[PDB]
Design an enzyme around this catalytic site. Structure first.
Site: not given
Lengths: 715, 430, 143
Positions: A360, A396
């Site tokens: 993330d 990401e």
């Protein structure tokens, strides 16, 4: 009247990181890094009394910057925590408050969550000099206890599922939330609904393989906290992108308790998935901790050694550098932090048997002080490590910091969330006209993005939906975000959604609108599973899952988020479509390619491997190639692919004709040379007998907003 | 790992230079035609490149998991921390080595310097790393040479050199004590020469360091004079007793137990011949030195008061009337702060074996015999008054038959100690 | 409350090798040390003579010197512990005991009383009243 001296103990070696049941010596080896603390105490709790310590041990042994002590007699399941002594100078960064009891950052199982209370903060809450006070309240009654775990587990039939598992070439990702997957699955018994064991049950394993995805991506399972401002509004952290420990699977998803049962029910879960040939990737937050900024709690890292672990304003050292938008950023420049991230990455691989990680806000791991350096120390060690070199690495490719958009800059071995594909494919079907370059480049795996660093189409993770943003139903069901249920008066959630509501906003009875969305949904599903690279489905989108316009449902632990499993015919009919479309992308190597298409003919063949056409059967010239369009037409010639399998054989497929017409109005297309047969359409109509086969450069009317695939039967 | 045989430019092109010269090698950034040389051997491996870092730890892991090596002694270890021009021990390669699962378990030894500018980095290597203690090497050779160094300089060396390694939270065993190594003289040549004799190297005797802190005993080279031979045999045993009685982990030089001689060549890298071969044919002089080193090794290994995991404090501990170590002077009176900084050729210290903060891996205290060691490097004799106990002779550097005034001492007696003599004593009564 | 006492007392005997000994104590000093491994005292700080050694008593006082134990573990290391002072007063009446040389700190008592701040540490051969029927253990912190 004793001393801590009259209690039998042994030195201890920082062999591990935290808890370590040593069966041969009958005891536990404890460990906790801290280079700045002055004294460290081990707190042992009994399962009955969990407010005051059953025993207070002072770790007197230190080897370098690591404290350790072996306690005889201890045994797995034993509850424990720490108190860290040291200087309190918030203006300088030293926020040591031994009144606060902290969790081992190496705990493989944490008991509870936090009973929120102004005493778990290290600073007197109401004080005008916030963050600069020293609140001397004991916080032990309120912090969950760490568990000594038994690491042993017998992985039946899984020792062999190691190796050429599912290559990134043929991977189809299916991103799931552990609890929402099965909370309203009254198919299974209660109390397993919405937990690890629920996901790995025979009913779900069958559904996952009936659908045909290869690997599942599990939303954050790193033990996490509901931040107070959600609980003080009656909310919880549903997504879990706010973790407190990197080794313990989350307790709330456990079906057998939190006293060690969650790591067991987790290990049993993926063992069960492996037996069905299903890879497992875990969404992992290493960029921030739930402790938040200053004014946030002091629950572990802040108490252990705050200077480390955390990125601080270098001139002040009181406030926290924030590149995640969540108060803090894990300082991944300190060697001990880098050892932790890799130690946990290795733990989950070798001990929990997970196959990959999708990081993330992964760019925040590359920030050194104010700069992004994709050749920083942490990344290099990850690239060289013998174990982590074999697992899948997905990023990401950004953080919300300045200069954080880092798409295409992650090293080899890495795959990236291709946000450019998502945004512009969404805009293409919206009605917008991007350059013919833009759509064609996304469709062929984004060579303009990833070829500059020598990466392959696998690096591109194509997706139309995600946990971030709309669902697929909601992308064709709303124009603006409707996140009132979050309780922030809609100042949360990103505003540009590249969304179209097909006419109306919300659920509708006007069937034409409804029929328009089913056409749009099918256009999205057809495009993604025919474009080069790795496709990622959002869990539930095959079921047309709906969050009622909430593009940021991190706080909703309820029916807005659950998978709704009982289907009417509209939902059921679309599910069969995604099934048969998934089956297509996997039966045809012309889309699971390890190399890109270039614009030539190969192997002495008269045909170009790929050709781009316009409305009338004519190759795309240079200036029409950069002129915008709502219509893309291209031919994939399978028998002239430079595709080699691992045995040195080239690969052949069909010659395919993909016609993607995003024009709202109709068009007539004059096909190229040959006889063509129709393989699917986004038409929910009884498909025309005139449209079933096309021959000899004849033309045909194509209704607005429609995607088609054709297979040449004769030339 | 700091340099490769391809030399600088003008060197051969046998591997790295051919495969990818700008990745593997540290090149002068403004020209990039010449090679940054921090090793003095032409080039320096560029440990800032990710794949070069991957290579070394792949090789380090290879020798551990595949060749079953137990540890590494890094040559010119500082040159591995060179990023562009500066040494910083927080580089990528050291960090990745520290975090690695398997390499975190084997011993890592450093030559704590390179020949660059600012390359002397003793005591700055990360923990888990041990260092060759060159400060121990030089000052011990000068002490027995005859020089009078501060009482605080050699006493620090003898207790594991805490002044060096304590500032970075290291332990006494992290210090690698040694008097001779492959660089420089051997122990036999150390007590037999005063100047280099690398004439056989073919470099006009310009190679190999000039200050060796050497002394001949009364000649230069082989001799028949019977005092020169003995001063040495006494000097050889004087070094041997010092090394294996000081805190830390001692490194013996191979062949020194055999009294090996390199004919005065303090830089025999090029000699693959009888100069460097081990001479296994032993006479009576050599054979009795072997038994000495045997019994001295047997001694150091039998007594935990020298295999210590924590340093000696200057204190009584556990509520005991003796302090774990005490320093005296010619008279049995304690060393003061002004005696402690004055130079000396005689250093006296008493290790109280039974009051050590030494704990084994099982949580047990250890304790040892109580020892008193006399190191008198003064060429002239000195008389020393013992402390209060009754002391027994266990070993000394005397070659002559040990006469019984010296074998047992009682009640603050005085005793003649010939010049350049090292003695170890064990208290049998108090 | 008594269960917790036996717990912490069991923990004591196992943390201190000076009582899990493979050899007996004899009455000498060892390893060239100035201290006797064990010494037996009477009410005033005086070693037990031969005829008071066979004369009856309701009071036993003895010092265990851990750092002069002839205790060897299976690896050939000797073992050290604390120097302990055990005062066992079975007299129904009170007594005042003059401690031996050194500074002593109190490790437990049979007192269920809030243990006196005067009894917490003893120094310099001072004396102290010890209530009847009472057992005590002391650990020398300084000499």
């Amino acid at each position: 009247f004793f001393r801590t001296r009259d209690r039998p103990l042994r030195p201890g070696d920082p062999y591990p990181l935290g808890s370590n049941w040593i069966e041969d010596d009958d005891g536990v080896n404890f460990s906790l890094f801290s280079e700045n603390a002055e004294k460290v105490e081990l707190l042992l709790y009994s399962l009955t009394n969990q407010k005051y310590p059953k025993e207070i041990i002072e770790v007197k042994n230190k080897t370098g910057d690591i404290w350790h002590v072996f306690v005889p007699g201890l045994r797995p399941g034993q509850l424990y925590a720490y108190r860290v002594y040291g200087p309190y100078k918030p203006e300088l960064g030293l926020r040591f408050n031994p009144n606060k009891v902290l969790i081992d950052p190496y705990a493989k199982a944490i008991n509870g969550s936090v009973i929120w209370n102004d005493a778990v903060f290290g600073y007197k809450i109401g004080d005008q000099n916030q963050d600069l006070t020293y609140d001397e309240r004991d916080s032990g009654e309120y912090v969950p206890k760490s568990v000594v775990i038994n690491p042993y587990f017998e992985w039946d039939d899984e020792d062999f599922i190691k190796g050429k598992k599912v290559p990134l070439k043929d991977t189809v990702i299916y991103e799931v939330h552990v609890k929402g997957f099965t909370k309203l699955r009254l198919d299974l018994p209660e109390n397993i609904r919405g937990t690890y064991e629920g996901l790995a049950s025979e009913q779900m394993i069958s559904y996952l393989k009936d659908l045909g995805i290869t690997t599942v991506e599990l939303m954050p399972v790193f033990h996490f906290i509901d931040q107070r401002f959600l609980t003080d509004k009656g909310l919880t952290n549903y997504w879990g992108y706010d973790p407190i420990n990197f080794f313990s699977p989350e307790c709330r998803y456990s079906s057998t308790g939190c006293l060690g049962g969650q790591v067991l029910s987790f290990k049993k879960m993926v063992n069960e998935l492996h037996n069905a040939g299903i890879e497992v990737i875990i969404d992992v937050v290493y960029n921030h901790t739930a402790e938040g900024n200053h004014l946030g709690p002091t629950l572990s890292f802040r108490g252990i050694d705050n200077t480390a672990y955390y990125m601080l304003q270098p001139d002040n050292k009181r406030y926290y550098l924030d590149f995640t938008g969540t108060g803090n950023t894990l300082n991944l420049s300190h060697p001990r932090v880098i050892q932790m991230v890799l130690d946990s990455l290795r733990y989950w691989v070798t001990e929990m048997h997970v196959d990959g990680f999708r990081f993330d806000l992964a760019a925040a791991l590359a920030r050194e002080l104010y700069s992004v350096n994709m050749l920083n120390t942490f990344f290099i060690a990850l690239q060289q490590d013998p174990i982590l070199s074999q697992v899948k690495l997905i990023a990401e490719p950004w953080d919300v910091g300045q200069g954080g958009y880092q798409v295409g800059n992650f090293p080899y071995q890495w795959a990236e969330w291709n946000g450019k594909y998502r945004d512009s494919i969404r805009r293409f079907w919206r009605g917008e006209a991007l350059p013919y370059s833009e759509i064609a480049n996304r469709l062929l795996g984004s060579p303009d993005i990833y070829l500059g660093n020598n990466k392959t189409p696998f690096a591109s993770i194509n997706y139309v939906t995600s946990h971030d943003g709309f669902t697929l139903e909601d992308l064709v069901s709303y124009n603006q975000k409707h996140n009132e249920a979050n309780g922030f008066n809609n100042q949360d959630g990103m505003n540009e959604n590249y969304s179209w509501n097909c006419g109306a906003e919300g659920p509708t009875n006007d069937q034409n609108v409804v029929i328009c969305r089913e056409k749009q949904k099918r256009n999205f599903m057809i495009t993604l599973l025919v474009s080069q690279g790795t496709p990622m489905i959002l869990g539930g989108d095959e079921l047309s899952r709906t969050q009622r316009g909430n593009n940021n449902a991190f706080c909703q632990d309820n029916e807005i988020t659950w998978f709704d499993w009982n289907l009417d015919e509209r939902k059921s009919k679309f599910l069969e479509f995604v099934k048969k479309m998934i089956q297509f992308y996997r039966a045809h190597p012309a889309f699971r390619r390890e190399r890109y298409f270039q614009g030539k003919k190969l192997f002495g063949m008269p045909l170009k491997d790929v050709t781009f056409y316009t409305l009338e059967g004519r190759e795309v010239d240079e200036k029409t190639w950069s002129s915008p369009t709502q219509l893309v037409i291209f031919v994939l010639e399978g028998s002239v692919m430079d595709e080699i399998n691992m045995y040195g054989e080239r690969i052949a497929d069909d010659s395919f004709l993909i016609i993607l017409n995003a024009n709202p109005n109709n068009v007539k297309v004059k096909f190229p040379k040959g006889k063509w047969e129709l393989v699917i359409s986004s038409y929910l109509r009884e498909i025309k007998p005139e449209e079933r086969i096309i021959e000899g450069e004849k033309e045909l009317e194509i209704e607005g907003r429609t995607a088609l695939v054709y297979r040449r039967i004769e030339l």
